[PDB]
Amino acid sequence: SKRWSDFWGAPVTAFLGNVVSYLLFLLLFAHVLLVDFQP
Amino acid sequence: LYLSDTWNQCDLLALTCFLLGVGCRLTPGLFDLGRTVLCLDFMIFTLRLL
Amino acid sequence: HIFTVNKQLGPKIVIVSKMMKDVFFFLFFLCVWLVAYGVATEGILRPQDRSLPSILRRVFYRPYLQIFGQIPQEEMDVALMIPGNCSMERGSWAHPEGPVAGSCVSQYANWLVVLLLIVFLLVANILLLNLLIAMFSYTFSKVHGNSDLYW
Amino acid sequence: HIFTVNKQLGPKIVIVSKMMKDVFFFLFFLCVWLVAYGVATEGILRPQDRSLPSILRRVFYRPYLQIFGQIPQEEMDVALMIPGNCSMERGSWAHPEGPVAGSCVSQYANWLVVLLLIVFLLVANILLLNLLIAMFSYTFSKVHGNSDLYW
Ligand code: NA
Ligand code: NA
Numbered sequence A: 001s002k003r004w005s006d007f008w009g010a011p012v013t014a015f016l017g018n019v020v021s022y023l024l025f026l027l028l029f030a031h032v033l034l035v036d037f038q039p
Numbered sequence B: 001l002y003l004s005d006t007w008n009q010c011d012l013l014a015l016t017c018f019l020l021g022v023g024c025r026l027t028p029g030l031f032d033l034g035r036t037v038l039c040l041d042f043m044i045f046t047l048r049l050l
Numbered sequence C, D: 001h002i003f004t005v006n007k008q009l010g011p012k013i014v015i016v017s018k019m020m021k022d023v024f025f026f027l028f029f030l031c032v033w034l035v036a037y038g039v040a041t042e043g044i045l046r047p048q049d050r051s052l053p054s055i056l057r058r059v060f061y062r063p064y065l066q067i068f069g070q071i072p073q074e075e076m077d078v079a080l081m082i083p084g085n086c087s088m089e090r091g092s093w094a095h096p097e098g099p100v101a102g103s104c105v106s107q108y109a110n111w112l113v114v115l116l117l118i119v120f121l122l123v124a125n126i127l128l129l130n131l132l133i134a135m136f137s138y139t140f141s142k143v144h145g146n147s148d149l150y151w
Helices: A003-007 A011-034 B007-026 B031-046 C010-044 C052-060 C062-066 C110-150 D010-044 D052-060 D062-066 D110-150
Strands: C093-095 D093-095
Touching: A011 B031, A011 C010, B007 B031, B031 C010, C010 C052, C010 C062, C010 C110, C010 D010, C010 D110, C052 C062, C062 C110, C110 D110, D010 D052, D010 D062, D010 D110, D052 D062, D062 D110
Parallel strands: none
Antiparallel strands: none
């Protein structure tokens, strides 16, 4: 239970989690806006 | 200290246009207005990545 | 790689690989702006032919050819389309030209699509391409001496 | 040659001949990339009208005009062509527009031809032309003083 907090504690993985979650936000926003937008 | 910067202001701007897009969508006669405000809002969320 | 031995074409072939960082920056800024423009004009006017490869075409492949001088006007402008009641939903519609722009296009707020076309051509044609010529001129004048020592 | 005597148009006519090494480099890199792109899109989609000057046209003369903004889209893309059983061989086919693009075009893996068009426009209209402006700016700032002493 040491290398778990070693990998996930570094700032590159907090940044990488930020970018991956933010691109999935834009993909969700695009799927809502383009494909299924019921009136 | 929040208001002084420009990307705290810009992310504030993307969320205020989001609230305006929802509140214009939920009224029954203003559907196409919210349909266009969310499109301009998607531009402001994607200029976040810079 | 065969002609790096030559006297005149030698160092100029060696230099080209040291310019690829600025092309990668340009692809970064272009893909951010290509998504931003593309989904906005796709949402504002919503076509009726909504297959997955068709909307990927008219999001990523119209604007990429727009920066090289290929601008389709008849596919996103009411004043160049013929109107008609071609849909079965509330609102006004139009009928575009070409088998890829969908069958119907909403007429609502089409002046805003004309403005997004103007802002796209400004940022892409003038802001990015002329900045890219600036970064190639600076990098080439900086690494020319080291690439002759290396060659 | 008559107007090299003049005071203002003098040295600027003398300089132009000392720039011809960089144009020769550009013709080198363009002809390598023009062959590489051209035979690949010619092999991927094989037309049925196979005269020798016709395939030399649609290998060397389409892409050379593509770097100057003349892009034919209706001659190499299924979604802009009308399909049909216009051949007598195994597979799916299409029918292009224009008397020079052949009579039939294979529909197999036409997304790869769209990708070779994108990679060609990237390397030609962005890498090579903006690198060529970089080499003219460096050479001109280097030989301007010697060409005034010579003039
Ligand atoms: Na043009
Ligand atoms: Na042009």
